[PDB]
Design a protein around this ligand. Structure first.
Ligand SMILES: Nc1ccc2oc(=O)ccc2c1
Length: 126
């Protein structure tokens, strides 16, 4: 069902939460070799999450589930704000700019926490 597909998407989202918090700790500790690996793992995860979200949105559209489509349009747009901040973060790591890395990391956390009520609303609407 589209609902069970969203729960699978929700799990991938929580995996990225776990890998992110770990990567944050590594960054604070200066373990750049770990950070690089966690950033690669996160990029794969966000690619998977985005795709599951697009398939869910497309299915809700084909189903005519107007409320779920509205919420998923809002949620995917925000997802892309998270994705842009993540990519800037990756560039800051490449460039050795720890000040920008810290900034983007905090921003990504705040964009994510904000989008959490909407994430739960989607589960109920699908
Ligand atoms: N909430 C959130 C946080 C980080 C993210 O990074 C990405 O690369 C794509 C989406 C995304 C969403």
């Amino acid at each position: 069902s589209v609902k069970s597909e969203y729960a699978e998407a929700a799990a991938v989202g929580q995996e990225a939460v776990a890998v992110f918090n770990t990567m944050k700790a590594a960054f604070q500790n200066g373990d750049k070799e770990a950070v690089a690996q966690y950033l690669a793992r996160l990029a794969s995860l966000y690619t998977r999450h985005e795709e599951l979200l697009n398939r869910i949105l497309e299915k809700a559209r084909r189903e005519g589930n107007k409320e779920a489509v509205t919420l998923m349009n809002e949620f995917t747009a925000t997802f892309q704000t998270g994705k842009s901040i993540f990519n800037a973060m990756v560039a800051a790591f490449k460039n050795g700019d720890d000040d920008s890395f810290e900034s983007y990391l905090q921003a990504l956390e705040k964009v994510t926490a904000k989008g959490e009520t909407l994430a739960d609303q989607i589960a109920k609407a699908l």
